[PDB]
Amino acid sequence: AETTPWGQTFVGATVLSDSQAGNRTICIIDSGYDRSHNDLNANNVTGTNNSGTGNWYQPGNNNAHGTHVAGTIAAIANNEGVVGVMPNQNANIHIVKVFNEAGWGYSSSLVAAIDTCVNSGGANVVTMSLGGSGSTTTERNALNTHYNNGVLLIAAAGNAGDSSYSYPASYDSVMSVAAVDSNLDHAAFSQYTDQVEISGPGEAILSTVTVGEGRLADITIGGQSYFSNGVVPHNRLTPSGTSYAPAPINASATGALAECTVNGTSFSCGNMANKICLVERVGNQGSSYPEINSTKACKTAGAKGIIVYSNSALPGLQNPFLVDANSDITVPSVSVDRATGLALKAKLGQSTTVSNQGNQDYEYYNGTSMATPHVSGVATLVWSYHPECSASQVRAALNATADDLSVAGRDNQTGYGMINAVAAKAYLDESCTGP
């Protein structure tokens, strides 16, 4: 079975066709591409090795970021795993691996990596889910030159949760991409600046990861799965010295579904022994990490499994940090969006199996790095319908057709709004400058 992550549907990639994408080339400057992955192996992908990062097609260990980004752009349609913006093995993809497990390892600069994308890869679009706080004139000039030469540059705004400028995203020649969740709400971590130009799916984004390094979750009732609805395994963290470290609980639990009622700030769980405890999330991640509150309420009650659903404040699918100071959550717990949580209410009392599984080939990630490939992927797809238009014209089309979010007009949190593939295409259908 193949799943279509919410982000793919929201940006409109599923309704268009990448049949002509062979006329476009997108270069991914990131941590490599796991070419051995079943959802990525047969893509029209190439790369240019660098002495400092080994093989572009071998990310290495714990360096799956680039593979996740690539999956959002081109996970192959094949009845397994997921699908990317251009899933039919048409688009040309070029890989430039600048990051190793330890960090940046490219023998040269970002400018050099971009040069490689253009000169060696023939890139039309260069996507960069990375950045730094520094800026220079030489770099600004180099990227402006590439942009004016017809290369569309797109980069992540950053996840610092402040107004700081991250580069290359903050240069005028590059599209700064912000992250939003499945309810189109601004992601708390997404940096907000006057450079932020457009938004894309960036919270709880399911995609491909280096084989065996992923993790998934599931909820089953009546022999049917809620996987396609979006079930996120709790990103559990427990104390590890002077900090916190990942301590995932991968197991399955089965029992009658029961809900811990939320009244004000108090919980009414009753006896959850031998049951799968459904509970509404109290509070939200931002200045703090409250996931542990609703989760612990269930555990303390004796729950065998736990399902936390989004509250009205942030109804979209959330993938928050489950900070477990006392390591109390020793049972499998997951997160689902509000709509799914309310649907589960009608199944109360029925046998339910909740499960978290490790050693998977896919995983849910959060980040402006996840929003970026939705934007660059769509940019490439839309551009394939009108390859004669320039990068600046395509960029303008995306901005002009984005769905306005948050407060009316362009804002620092979401830019012009949510990218819209269908609308952008219709725009260029009239002409390279729109109607």
Binding site: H65, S129, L130, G131
Partner: peptide
Amino acid sequence: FXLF
């Protein structure tokens, strides 16, 4: 210079 990180991934985002």
